[PDB]
Design an enzyme around this catalytic site. Structure first.
Site, PDB file in Angstrom:
ATOM      1  N   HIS A 165       0.542   7.645   2.019  1.00  9.14           N
ATOM      2  CA  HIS A 165      -0.671   8.388   2.217  1.00  9.14           C
ATOM      3  C   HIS A 165      -0.584   8.881   3.560  1.00  9.14           C
ATOM      4  O   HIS A 165       0.196   8.680   4.712  1.00  9.14           O
ATOM      5  CB  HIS A 165      -1.907   7.280   2.122  1.00  9.14           C
ATOM      6  CG  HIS A 165      -1.786   6.461   3.385  1.00  9.14           C
ATOM      7  ND1 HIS A 165      -0.800   5.254   3.455  1.00  9.14           N
ATOM      8  CD2 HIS A 165      -2.505   6.400   4.486  1.00  9.14           C
ATOM      9  CE1 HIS A 165      -1.170   4.612   4.341  1.00  9.14           C
ATOM     10  NE2 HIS A 165      -2.083   5.056   5.085  1.00  9.14           N
ATOM     11  N   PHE A 195       0.915  -1.028  -0.190  1.00 10.16           N
ATOM     12  CA  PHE A 195      -0.095  -0.006   0.091  1.00 10.16           C
ATOM     13  C   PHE A 195       0.854   1.123  -0.053  1.00 10.16           C
ATOM     14  O   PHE A 195       1.722   1.348   0.818  1.00 10.16           O
ATOM     15  CB  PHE A 195      -0.992  -0.072   1.317  1.00 10.16           C
ATOM     16  CG  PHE A 195      -2.075   0.984   1.006  1.00 10.16           C
ATOM     17  CD1 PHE A 195      -3.270   0.518   0.516  1.00 10.16           C
ATOM     18  CD2 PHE A 195      -1.958   2.199   1.922  1.00 10.16           C
ATOM     19  CE1 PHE A 195      -4.307   1.587   0.393  1.00 10.16           C
ATOM     20  CE2 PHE A 195      -3.265   3.080   1.784  1.00 10.16           C
ATOM     21  CZ  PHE A 195      -4.276   2.965   0.906  1.00 10.16           C
ATOM     22  N   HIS A 224       2.884   7.790   5.530  1.00 11.57           N
ATOM     23  CA  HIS A 224       3.368   6.414   5.991  1.00 11.57           C
ATOM     24  C   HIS A 224       2.947   5.526   4.764  1.00 11.57           C
ATOM     25  O   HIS A 224       2.151   5.840   4.123  1.00 11.57           O
ATOM     26  CB  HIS A 224       2.927   5.659   7.279  1.00 11.57           C
ATOM     27  CG  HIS A 224       1.655   5.887   7.465  1.00 11.57           C
ATOM     28  ND1 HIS A 224       0.936   7.196   7.539  1.00 11.57           N
ATOM     29  CD2 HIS A 224       0.790   5.075   7.481  1.00 11.57           C
ATOM     30  CE1 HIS A 224      -0.633   6.921   8.074  1.00 11.57           C
ATOM     31  NE2 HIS A 224      -0.476   5.699   7.771  1.00 11.57           N
ATOM     32  N   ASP A 255      -3.601   9.616   6.799  1.00 10.76           N
ATOM     33  CA  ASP A 255      -4.793   9.024   7.135  1.00 10.76           C
ATOM     34  C   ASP A 255      -5.898  10.034   7.027  1.00 10.76           C
ATOM     35  O   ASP A 255      -5.544  11.508   7.350  1.00 10.76           O
ATOM     36  CB  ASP A 255      -4.745   8.488   8.532  1.00 10.76           C
ATOM     37  CG  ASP A 255      -3.878   7.015   8.615  1.00 10.76           C
ATOM     38  OD1 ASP A 255      -3.464   6.707   7.583  1.00 10.76           O
ATOM     39  OD2 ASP A 255      -3.768   6.685   9.932  1.00 10.76           O
TER      40      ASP A 255
HETATM   41  C1  LIG Z   1      -2.065   1.298   7.337  1.00 13.56           C
HETATM   42  C2  LIG Z   1      -3.213   0.429   7.948  1.00 13.56           C
HETATM   43  C3  LIG Z   1      -4.065   1.250   8.891  1.00 13.56           C
HETATM   44  C4  LIG Z   1      -4.146  -0.157   6.840  1.00 13.56           C
HETATM   45  N1  LIG Z   1      -4.370   0.765   5.887  1.00 13.56           N
HETATM   46  C5  LIG Z   1      -5.596   1.288   5.883  1.00 13.56           C
HETATM   47  O1  LIG Z   1      -6.584   0.999   6.743  1.00 13.56           O
HETATM   48  C6  LIG Z   1      -5.888   2.137   4.881  1.00 13.56           C
HETATM   49  C7  LIG Z   1      -4.865   3.533   4.913  1.00 13.56           C
HETATM   50  S1  LIG Z   1      -4.817   4.347   6.663  1.00 13.56           S
HETATM   51  N2  LIG Z   1      -7.377   2.889   5.043  1.00 13.56           N
HETATM   52  C8  LIG Z   1      -8.246   2.928   4.185  1.00 13.56           C
HETATM   53  O2  LIG Z   1      -8.293   2.477   3.208  1.00 13.56           O
HETATM   54  C9  LIG Z   1      -9.395   3.881   4.602  1.00 13.56           C
HETATM   55  C10 LIG Z   1     -10.677   3.115   5.238  1.00 13.56           C
HETATM   56  C11 LIG Z   1     -12.113   3.693   5.478  1.00 13.56           C
HETATM   57  C12 LIG Z   1     -13.069   2.749   5.956  1.00 13.56           C
HETATM   58  N3  LIG Z   1     -13.469   1.888   4.833  1.00 13.56           N
HETATM   59  C13 LIG Z   1     -14.377   3.895   6.222  1.00 13.56           C
HETATM   60  O3  LIG Z   1     -15.163   3.805   5.707  1.00 13.56           O
HETATM   61  O4  LIG Z   1     -14.117   4.390   7.618  1.00 13.56           O
HETATM   62  C14 LIG Z   1      -3.315  -1.532   6.177  1.00 13.56           C
HETATM   63  O5  LIG Z   1      -2.770  -2.310   6.990  1.00 13.56           O
HETATM   64  O6  LIG Z   1      -3.274  -1.630   4.857  1.00 13.56           O
HETATM   65 FE   LIG Z   2      -2.767   4.816   7.077  1.00 14.96          FE
END
Ligand SMILES: CC(C)[C@@H](NC(=O)[C@H](CS)NC(=O)CCC[C@H](N)C(=O)O)C(=O)O
Ligand SMILES: [Fe+2]
EC number: 1.21.3.1
Length: 329
Positions: free
Chosen positions: A212, A209, A268, A214
């Site tokens: 980005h 990933f 990150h 958060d």
């Molecule tokens: C980095 C971690 C937090 C995780 N990544 C993630 O969760 C990534 C980046 S923070 N986050 C997202 O895609 C947003 C999800 C929002 C969720 N569907 C909602 O409606 O609230 C991973 O392990 O990929």
């Molecule tokens: Fe994140």
């Protein structure tokens, strides 16, 4: 090659208590971490993370393709036009490795006025059949309020660290309207691992990933004990060491907005690692109409020229933007 980030372990237990001086000493540690790499580990948090990990594994490993279609968000199932956030995010064999399940405030029911009004970003959770996954829904809803409690205490620490009264953030973080979400993410072991699911960074690093910020006020993350996260600094990306007893905490871009970037949202990314692991974030979001007047801790008067930003509008834009930049998860 790659250095290691300084991520301190902060005993957050005083934030549940009444010793005001001890809470200030926690706030000082939060301030220092938020001004350095932007990450810290919260320890002595009181959440049974062993049961969290066990119940999550039992769910991921026993759900069937049939159930995944029934729970899928609209990106994967055209019939579910009302599921944008809540539901199952399918993996694509040979193409996409990660799969996850997202749920929202359990108080979002058909009776809830935000659901009646069809307000964006509010949805009713979808759940698997109780007889096929006994106790799962009961566990997941209880966990939501467990980590809600931890998060409320952390927000008192952030408030004190910034020179505000301890309810400055927490007063907008309420059980009846919070847009906070839990995501239960499975990163599988795969052999062979599909090349399409691996991204190559500008610096050559293989990623699951990309970089980005958060979309959150803060993010409260439990992961299993496999090193994967990196944080960007001026000198390059640094590895964040894993710790499967603590919660990893960082600010989201809403905190950066309201502090005039005093507490930045750390950039990150997730390295590619071929290992079965779990990533279980709780995204601390406020209510749809929550507004916090921005301020600048650097200035004596605290005055800032940034516009107040309604959390609902921030969240709607930020979620779409993240999908567009880093892809549909
Ligand atoms: C980095 C971690 C937090 C995780 N990544 C993630 O969760 C990534 C980046 S923070 N986050 C997202 O895609 C947003 C999800 C929002 C969720 N569907 C909602 O409606 O609230 C991973 O392990 O990929
Ligand atoms: Fe994140």
């Amino acid at each position: 090659s790659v250095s290691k980030a300084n991520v301190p372990k902060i005993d957050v237990s005083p934030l549940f208590g009444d010793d005001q001086a001890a809470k200030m000493r926690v706030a000082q540690q939060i301030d220092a971490a938020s001004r350095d790499t932007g990450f810290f580990y919260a320890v002595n948090h009181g959440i049974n993370v062993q049961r969290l990990s066990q119940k999550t594994k039992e769910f991921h490993m026993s759900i069937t393709p049939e159930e995944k279609w029934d729970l899928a968000i609209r990106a994967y199932n055209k019939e579910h036009q009302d599921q944008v956030r809540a539901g199952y995010y399918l993996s694509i064999p040979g193409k996409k490795a990660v799969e996850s399940f997202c749920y929202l405030n359990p108080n979002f029911t058909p009776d809830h006025p935000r659901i009646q009004a069809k307000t964006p970003t509010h949805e009713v959770n979808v759940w698997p059949d109780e007889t096929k996954h006994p106790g799962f829904q009961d566990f997941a809803e209880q966990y939501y309020w467990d980590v809600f409690g931890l998060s409320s205490a952390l927000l008192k620490g952030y408030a004190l660290a910034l020179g505000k009264e301890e309810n400055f953030f927490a007063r907008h973080f309420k059980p009846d309207d919070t847009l906070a979400s839990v995501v239960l993410i499975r990163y599988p072991y795969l052999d062979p691992y599909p090349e399409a699911a691996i991204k190559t960074a500008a610096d050559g690093t293989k990623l699951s990933f990309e970089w980005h910020e958060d979309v959150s006020l803060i993010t409260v993350l439990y992961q299993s004990n496999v090193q994967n996260l990196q944080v960007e600094t001026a000198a390059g990306y640094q590895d964040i060491e894993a710790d499967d007893t603590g919660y990893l905490i960082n600010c989201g871009s809403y905190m950066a907005h309201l502090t005039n970037n005093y507490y930045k949202a750390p950039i990150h990314r997730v390295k590619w690692v071929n290992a079965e692991r779990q990533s279980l974030p709780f995204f601390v979001n406020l209510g749809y109409d929550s507004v916090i007047d921005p301020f600048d801790p650097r200035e004596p008067n605290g005055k800032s020229d940034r516009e107040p930003l309604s959390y609902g509008d921030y969240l709607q834009n930020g979620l779409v933007s993240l999908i567009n930049k880093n892809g549909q998860t």
